[PDB]
From a paper:
One of the major and widespread PTMs is acylation of the ε-amino group of lysine residues. Canonical acyllysine readers, bromodomain and double PHD finger (DPF), display comparable binding capabilities toward various short acyl chain modifications, and while the YEATS domain exhibits preference for crotonyllysine, it still associates albeit more weakly with other acyllysine marks. In this study, we elucidate the significance of π stacking components in targeting of acetyllysines by the YEATS domains and report a previously uncharacterized DNA-binding activity of the human AF9-YEATS domain. Collectively, our results have illuminated the mechanistic basis underlying distinct recognition of acyllysine PTMs by the YEATS domains of yeast Taf14 and human AF9, allowing us to develop a Taf14-YEATS module that selects for the crotonyl modification and discriminates against saturated acyl modifications.
We next explored the possibility of engineering an AF9-based acyllysine-specific reader through mutating Y78 in AF9-YEATS to a tryptophan and therefore re-creating the WA motif seen in the Taf14-YEATS G82A mutant. Although NMR titration experiments revealed a tight interaction of AF9-YEATS Y78W with H3K9cr, binding affinities measured by fluorescence spectroscopy indicated that this mutant does not differentiate between H3K9cr and H3K9ac and associates with both peptides with a Kd of 2 μM. To explain the different behavior of Taf14-YEATS G82A and AF9-YEATS Y78W, we obtained the crystal structure of AF9-YEATS Y78W in complex with H3K9cr peptide. In this complex, W78 was in a single r1 conformation, which was engaged in π stacking with the crotonyl amide. Notably, A79 imposed steric hindrance on W78 to a higher degree than on wild-type Y78 at this position, resulting in a tilted conformation of W78.
Author numbering:
A (entry chain B): 5 to 10
B (entry chain A): 1 to 137
């Protein structure tokens, strides 16, 4: 899956 | 005094995520849609006041509020995040809301689009007469 942001 | 009641409702949370044909100007690579509904097209508006999706700060006006069905947000973006969803009830005694951390994940280009379904069973122990009336539709 893609990057995640916080 | 001798009787006791537990009402159970089913909720369906989910989302769809697809890589776009072309990105947007900011580099948004995906189009996604997140929703709350009832199974088998049941009408949860009977007992649901509003649904609040808490987007990630990077979106303009992240608090997205749907007071009527469909309870859904359609966005474009580039990365997945944890998306608090609050479901508010047409009642007056706790609980008045329920919260879920919904994982809005995206797949990479070349990987299958997301079509995700998450179940939740809510139990209300001995609600008010009015609230039980609407829970039972």
């Amino acid at each position: 899956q893609t990057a995640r942001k916080s | 005094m001798a009787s006791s009641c537990a009402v159970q409702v089913k909720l369906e949370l989910g989302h769809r995520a697809q890589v776009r044909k072309k990105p947007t100007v900011e580099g948004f690579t995906h189009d996604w849609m997140v929703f709350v509904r009832g199974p088998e097209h049941s009408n949860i508006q009977h007992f649901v006041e509003k649904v609040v999706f808490h987007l990630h700060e990077s979106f303009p006006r992240p608090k997205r509020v749907c007071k009527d069905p469909p309870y859904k947000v359609e966005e474009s973006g580039w990365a997945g995040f944890i998306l608090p969803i609050e479901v508010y009830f047409k009642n007056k005694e706790e609980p008045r809301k329920v919260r879920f951390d919904y994982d809005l994940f995206l797949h990479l280009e070349g990987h299958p689009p997301v079509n995700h379904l998450r179940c939740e069973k809510l139990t209300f122990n001995n609600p008010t007469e009015d609230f039980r009336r609407k829970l039972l539709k």
